[PDB]
Amino acid sequence: ITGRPEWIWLALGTALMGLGTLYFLVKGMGVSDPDAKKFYAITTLVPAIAFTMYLSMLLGYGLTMVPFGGEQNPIYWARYADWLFTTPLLLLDLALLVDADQGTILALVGADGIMIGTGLVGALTKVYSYRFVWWAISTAAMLYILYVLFFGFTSKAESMRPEVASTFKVLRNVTVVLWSAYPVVWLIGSEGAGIVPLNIETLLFMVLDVSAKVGFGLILLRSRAIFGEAE
Amino acid sequence: ITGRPEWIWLALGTALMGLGTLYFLVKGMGVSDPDAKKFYAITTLVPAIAFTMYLSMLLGYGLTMVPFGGEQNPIYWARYADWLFTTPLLLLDLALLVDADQGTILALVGADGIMIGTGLVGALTKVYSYRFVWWAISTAAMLYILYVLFFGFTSKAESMRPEVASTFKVLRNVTVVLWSAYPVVWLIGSEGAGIVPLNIETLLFMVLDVSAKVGFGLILLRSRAIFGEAE
Amino acid sequence: ITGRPEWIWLALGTALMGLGTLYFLVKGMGVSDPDAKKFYAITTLVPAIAFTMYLSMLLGYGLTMVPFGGEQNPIYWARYADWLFTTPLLLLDLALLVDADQGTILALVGADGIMIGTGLVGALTKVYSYRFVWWAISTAAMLYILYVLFFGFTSKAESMRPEVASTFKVLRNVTVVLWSAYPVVWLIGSEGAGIVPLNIETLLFMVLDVSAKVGFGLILLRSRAIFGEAE
Ligand SMILES: CC(C)CCC[C@@H](C)CCC[C@@H](C)CCC[C@@H](C)CCOC[C@@H](CO)OCC[C@H](C)CCC[C@H](C)CCC[C@H](C)CCCC(C)C
Numbered sequence: 050i051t052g053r054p055e056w057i058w059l060a061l062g063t064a065l066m067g068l069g070t071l072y073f074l075v076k077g078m079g080v081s082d083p084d085a086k087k088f089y090a091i092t093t094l095v096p097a098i099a100f101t102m103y104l105s106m107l108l109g110y111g112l113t114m115v116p117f118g119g120e121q122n123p124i125y126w127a128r129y130a131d132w133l134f135t136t137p138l139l140l141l142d143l144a145l146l147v148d149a150d151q152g153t154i155l156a157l158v159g160a161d162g163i164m165i166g167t168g169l170v171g172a173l174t175k176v177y178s179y180r181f182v183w184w185a186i187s188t189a190a191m192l193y194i195l196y197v198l199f200f201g202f203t204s205k206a207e208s209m210r211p212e213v214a215s216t217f218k219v220l221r222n223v224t225v226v227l228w229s230a231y232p233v234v235w236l237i238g239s240e241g242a243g244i245v246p247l248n249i250e251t252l253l254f255m256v257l258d259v260s261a262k263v264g265f266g267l268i269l270l271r272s273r274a275i276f277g278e279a280e
Numbered sequence: 281i282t283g284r285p286e287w288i289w290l291a292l293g294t295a296l297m298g299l300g301t302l303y304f305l306v307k308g309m310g311v312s313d314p315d316a317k318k319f320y321a322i323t324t325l326v327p328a329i330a331f332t333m334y335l336s337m338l339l340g341y342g343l344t345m346v347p348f349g350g351e352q353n354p355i356y357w358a359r360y361a362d363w364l365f366t367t368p369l370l371l372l373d374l375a376l377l378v379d380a381d382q383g384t385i386l387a388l389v390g391a392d393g394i395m396i397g398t399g400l401v402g403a404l405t406k407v408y409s410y411r412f413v414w415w416a417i418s419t420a421a422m423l424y425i426l427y428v429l430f431f432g433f434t435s436k437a438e439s440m441r442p443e444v445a446s447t448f449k450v451l452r453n454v455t456v457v458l459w460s461a462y463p464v465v466w467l468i469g470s471e472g473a474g475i476v477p478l479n480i481e482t483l484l485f486m487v488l489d490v491s492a493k494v495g496f497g498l499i500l501l502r503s504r505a506i507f508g509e510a511e
Numbered sequence: 512i513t514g515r516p517e518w519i520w521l522a523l524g525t526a527l528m529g530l531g532t533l534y535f536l537v538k539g540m541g542v543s544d545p546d547a548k549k550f551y552a553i554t555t556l557v558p559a560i561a562f563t564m565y566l567s568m569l570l571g572y573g574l575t576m577v578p579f580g581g582e583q584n585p586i587y588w589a590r591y592a593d594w595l596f597t598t599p600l601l602l603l604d605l606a607l608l609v610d611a612d613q614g615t616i617l618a619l620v621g622a623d624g625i626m627i628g629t630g631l632v633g634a635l636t637k638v639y640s641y642r643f644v645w646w647a648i649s650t651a652a653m654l655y656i657l658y659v660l661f662f663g664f665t666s667k668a669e670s671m672r673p674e675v676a677s678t679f680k681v682l683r684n685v686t687v688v689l690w691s692a693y694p695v696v697w698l699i700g701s702e703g704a705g706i707v708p709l710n711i712e713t714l715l716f717m718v719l720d721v722s723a724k725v726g727f728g729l730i731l732l733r734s735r736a737i738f739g740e741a742e
Pocket residue numbers: 133158159162163165166167169170173560563574575588591592593595596631
């Protein structure tokens with residue numbers, strides 16, 4: 050385990066997702082409101098899944114070697130298994146907040162699936178130049194998601210409760226900034242151009258992941274917006 | 281096929297899931313009620329999926345060799361492919377019975393996914409001691425599911441029709457007893473401590489599977505609880 | 512890339528799915544109706560997914576070699592990854608058109624999953640004779656889907672708006688004819704009996720895919736049936 054310099058960030062990531070999971074689980078114990086239960090369910094599942102996949106990376110299961118550039122390159126494939134489930138869940142949190150129509154939810158989740166799936170293919174592609182073709186397609190899918198979060202959702206929120214509008218706005222901004230960093234880290238890290246070494250890359254992803262999941266969740270679950278308006 | 285002593289239980293399992301599938305399909309032919317159609321759909325799909333995966337194990341496709349303990353260990357991975365889809369379907373049957381809120385359904389299905397996914401990782405893990413780490417996490421996810429089935433669902437059922445309350449109670453009890461045996465069999469069988477040989481392990485899983493799927497389905501689909509109250 | 516004679520059909524397929532995707536995306540820009548948004552979302556996702564998987568086949572990622580018949584046989588596994596997601600989406604388009612009950616939708620999607628999953632197992636099976644066992648099970652699942660599209664849906668459509676009835680009828684007929692060709696092509700092509708060479712097989716699948724996705728989508732998205740009745 051300790052033979053990989055990035056182990057420390059995997060261990061920290063595992064611990065923080067674990068602690069985040071336990072905290073949200075305990076916090077959601079005293080919740081009977083059906084709307085709030087949905088948000089607690091979605092939001093607690095996110096670090097729970099991330100916990101399992103961080104642990105899989107820490108123990109070495111979620112790592113494979115991919116030959117490109119005439120080298121055996123360590124690729125943590127478990128990230129994509131995580132993101133495949135957790136990024137649509139995060140989008141669902143946002144979509145449910147603003148009472149998105151079903152068509153838009155399907156568009157988001159579908160685009161997200163394409164984003165992660167093509168990122169995975171890019172990560173495992175042995176022809177070096179083609180890795181960036183997949184990166185570009187995945188990034189286009191991300192750009193679509195970001196467009197919808199801004200020019201389909203933000204104007205929907207203004208027509209809703211002020212607490213849901215303000216909470217959505219914060220979470221939207223957090224999401225757009227944090228999510229946009231991922232293709233950059235991939236591009237310059239071990240999966241892409243290889244300018245940033247894997248240990249630093251792992252640190253960067255860990256900071257992004259904890260912020261995008263536990264940070265996000267802390268903001269969401271402390272908000273009154275997740276409760277139905279009741280007396 | 282006959283070169284594996286466990287083939288007989290795989291063959292029997294295949295036949296019983298097949299027959300179970302055909303029986304539920306025929307039985308559901310004369311059903312127009314929209315609620316009953318949901319239960320027939322869910323409940324017929326369960327042995328249909330199990331049929332395909334038993335057949336895959338029988339024909340040898342759903343088997344791989346995993347090196348641990350300095351041995352090549354036969355691991356039937358197809359079980360997890362089965363359970364990944366059939367256990368949430370079984371939980372959906374229960375959840376729909378008691379008209380569970382969406383948040384609770386998501387919690388159940390999500391926990392179930394974690395249960396099966398981590399069981400799969402445990403099954404394929406090459407570091408012997410780590411297999412039991414995954415077993416423990418999976419078992420914790422199972423315990424969460426069982427907690428919800430008792431302390432989130434049972435009190436919901438009492439507020440519903442007597443036929444749905446009584447049927448849920450029976451199916452809940454069947455589910456908790458049968459499902460709890462699976463981590464025990466895994467732990468002592470070829471995936472875990474290796475005390476019980478694979479042929480007996482396969483027998484045990486076959487008895488559990490047929491009971492948890494066809495047995496469960498027979499109880500559910502004979503009940504009046506799957507029909508909306510109509511005149 | 513050009514080393515495989517079928518590359519031309521993969522390239523054409525990629526281009527046509529890409530163009531189809533862009534066309535539906537642009538066309539759906541000026542849509543606010545919640546019902547129409549659902550259909551645009553579903554129908555645009557279908558060629559988008561197919562685009563990615565055609566590209567994966569073109570670049571060689573979505574190809575593996577399967578030993579059977581004492582030969583190394585090129586099997587494009589990416590087709591199943593495509594179909595796993597796009598065929599239920601296509602069925603959802605049809606089901607939503609006729610306002611299918613949830614039980615029937617689950618039956619369709621479930622049968623479809625079995626159809627594609629067993630086709631995949633058949634495609635990767637190393638025992639030649641067993642490949643056709645999987646083909647038969649998959650074809651039985653297809654026959655179930657076709658039965659439901661005719662003897663569960665058609666009589667539902669007649670009870671609905673004339674525009675939805677007529678559009679459903681056309682799309683149903685297109686779907687039944689086109690989908691039925693797939694098991695035939697598989698059976699006689701490289702996955703099955705090997706009578707038709709892979710380059711021609713790839714052409715046939717490309718024509719079917721573009722017709723079943725872009726052709727289908729063009730018919731659906733030009734129809735008034737995807738809009739709620741409004742003044
Ligand atoms: C609505 C939305 C959800 C839509 C989703 C968008 C989605 C279509 C985007 C593309 C997803 C697709 C790329 C997933 C591919 C998974 C693949 C990387 C798994 C690894 O297999 C790749 C090679 C080794 O590199 O296997 C060696 C060859 C082996 C023989 C491989 C054979 C097994 C195949 C992998 C079977 C395909 C199953 C499905 C791809 C499962 C989906 C997995 C998940 C990652 C989407």
